């Protein structure tokens, strides 16, 4: 298994995080998830 270069909760970019946290926001790593609620194309269904 190899999907976590650090995982210390702090990162400088998205590549500075691990698999469990594919996103790097606020100098920290978290779950990226989907884009945003509502949706830019069709906010229904």
UniProtKB/Swiss-Prot annotation:
Keyword Chloroplast: no
Disulphide bridges: 4-18, 11-24, 17-29
PROSITE patterns (alphabetical): OMEGA_ACTX_2 (PS60017)
SUPFAM superfamilies, per the entry: omega toxin-like
Name recorded for this polypeptide: Omega-hexatoxin-Hv2a
Single GO term (MF): sodium channel inhibitor activity
Function of the molecule: Potent inhibitor of insect (bee brain), but not mammalian (rat trigeminal neurons), voltage-gated calcium channels (Cav). In vivo, injection into lone star ticks (Amblyomma americanum) induces curling of all eight legs into closed loops, followed by death.
Family per similarity comment: Belongs to the neurotoxin 15 family. 02 (omega-actx) subfamily.
InterPro entries, per the entry: Omega_atracotoxin_CS2 (IPR013139), Toxin_23 (IPR012628)
Compartment(s) of residence: Secreted
GO cellular component terms, A-Z: extracellular region
Lineage per the UniProt record: Eukaryota, Metazoa, Ecdysozoa, Arthropoda, Chelicerata
One Pfam family linked to the record: Toxin_23
Domains as described in the record: The presence of a 'disulfide through disulfide knot' structurally defines this protein as a knottin.
Keywords, sorted A to Z: Calcium channel impairing toxin, Disulfide bond, Ion channel impairing toxin, Knottin, Neurotoxin, Secreted, Toxin, Voltage-gated calcium channel impairing toxin
Predominant cellular place of this UniProt entry's protein: secreted
Expression by tissue: Expressed by the venom gland.
């Amino acid at each position: 298994l190899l999907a976590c270069l650090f995982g210390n909760g702090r990162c400088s970019s998205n590549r500075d995080c691990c698999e469990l946290t594919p996103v790097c926001k606020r100098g920290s790593c978290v779950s990226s998830g989907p884009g945003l609620v509502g949706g830019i194309l069709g906010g229904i269904l």
